């Protein structure tokens, strides 16, 4: 697929035709539009002094 198509929220369906199941299941994959963007904050937590005892 194209990059612009994914950002447009197009509906894509994958269907599988298997002998066991007479009804092909439908799965819908689409990017949820209308969501806000936020800057992720990366925090690093060093190990505590109570963990560095058993070596």
């Amino acid at each position: 697929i194209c990059e612009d198509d994914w950002n447009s929220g197009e509906r894509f369906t994958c269907t599988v035709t298997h002998t066991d199941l007479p009804s092909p299941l439908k799965q819908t994959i689409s990017r949820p539009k209308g969501v806000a963007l936020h800057r992720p904050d990366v925090y690093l937590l060093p190990p505590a002094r109570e963990q560095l005892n058993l070596r």
Binding site: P22, S23, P24
Partner: protein, 97 residues
């Protein structure tokens, strides 16, 4: 003048490509035209008509080649019978699907 009976056979539920048979019986006169439809679209190839035989009544049988994938997709197959200016349509589908 008797209206022809339209019957369409389906593959077994537990498995069989397969074939579709449309049979017209107890009809008069001998000439009769039988065709096939797929989701309301005309079929141009993949079907054959056997010569009309005598069962006075006549019998005509037709065979349509179908694929397993199309059958599982709930495709609609219709047998069209034309006789004495009358058109008969029969719709069939998978019972388990």
């Amino acid at each position: 003048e008797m209206n022809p009976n339209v019957n369409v056979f389906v593959p077994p539920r537990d498995g069989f490509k397969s074939k579709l048979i449309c049979e017209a019986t107890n009809f008069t006169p001998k000439p009769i035209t039988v065709s096939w439809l797929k989701d309301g679209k005309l079929v141009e190839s993949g079907f054959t008509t056997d010569p009309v035989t005598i069962e006075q009544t006549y019998k005509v049988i037709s065979t349509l080649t179908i694929s397993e994938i199309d059958w599982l997709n709930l495709n609609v197959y219709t047998c069209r019978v034309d006789h004495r200016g009358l058109t008969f349509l029969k719709n069939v589908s998978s019972t388990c699907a």
